[PDB]
């Protein structure tokens, strides 16, 4: 029982049409309705900039030096900057076939437009910086649990 025709190159395997997964994928900030592209950018930046600093925080060539925290902070700062650069220029050259390939039962949203992409990139920048600083604060006091010692 395919989506619309059993001869199309798609299959109804219980991993791409399971109710659990479709609910879990629909409400993501990339698709959940009732929001603005601004908030989408904010949240995606928050998340990614909140996790994309560890992978080199204690892993960088300055791994065990007494500064590496702010080092990883600066690194992920530049990282999110250049990522915003990339997405912005993609928007700049964006509009051949101004769509996104749709497989979710509904269209995602009107988020699919140039200036929408630009605003999204701005919100991405803001949220990414924010996630960066907040992760740096969580990690700042190595004693964050030592004061609790629990």
């Amino acid at each position: 029982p395919s989506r619309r025709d059993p001869q199309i190159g798609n299959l109804e395997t219980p991993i791409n049409n399971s109710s659990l997964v479709k609910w879990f994928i629909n409400n993501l900030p990339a698709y959940r309705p009732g929001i603005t592209p601004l908030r989408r950018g904010l949240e995606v930046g928050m998340a990614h900039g909140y996790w994309l600093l560890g992978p080199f925080a204690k892993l960088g060539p300055l791994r065990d030096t007494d500064v590496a925290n702010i080092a990883g902070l600066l690194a992920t700062l530049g990282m999110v900057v250049i990522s915003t650069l990339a997405v912005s220029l993609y928007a700049a050259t964006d509009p051949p076939k101004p769509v996104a390939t749709v497989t979710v039962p509904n269209p995602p949203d009107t988020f699919d437009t140039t200036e929408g992409w630009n605003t999204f990139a701005s919100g991405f920048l803001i949220g990414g910086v924010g996630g960066a600083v907040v992760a740096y604060f969580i990690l700042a006091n190595i004693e964050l649990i030592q004061n609790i010692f629990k």
Binding site: S2, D5, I8, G9, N10, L11, E12
Partner: protein, 135 residues
């Protein structure tokens, strides 16, 4: 509206074949037997109408040439190109059973009935962009 009995695959229609073009084929098969499809699959047809949707101008003509008339002798199949707007083209069949040589007078656009021994030349044909035909 008849389509053969198949269990689904993973190589059917794509992001182009509904943004640029569609292909369809249909005939009359008064029997039901197992057949093979170029995207892979061994299935059964049904009596009379046999409608099938596809994306390439090669799977269709392969079915029409080798399967239908060379094995099943069926020869009443339309093959239809479709535009993005949903409108259709009727390229072939244009001669009934595609014999490709029989008619009482035929079309006439363009002719070159000349040998090769006197060929176009680089230094003689120059400062323009015509091809190997105009003498």
């Amino acid at each position: 509206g008849q389509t053969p009995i198949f269990g689904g695959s993973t190589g059917g229609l794509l992001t182009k074949a509904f943004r640029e073009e569609k292909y369809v084929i249909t005939w009359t098969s008064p029997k039901e037997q197992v057949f093979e499809m170029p995207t892979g699959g061994a299935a059964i047809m049904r009596q009379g109408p046999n409608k099938l949707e596809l994306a390439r101008k090669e799977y269709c003509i392969a079915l029409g040439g080798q399967q239908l008339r060379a094995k099943f002798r069926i020869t009443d199949y339309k093959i239809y190109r479709v535009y993005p707007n949903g409108e259709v083209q009727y390229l072939h069949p244009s001669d009934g059973v595609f014999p490709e040589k029989v008619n009482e007078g035929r079309q006439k656009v363009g002719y070159v009935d000349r040998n090769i021994g006197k060929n176009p030349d680089p230094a003689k044909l120059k400062f323009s962009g015509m091809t190997t035909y105009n003498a």
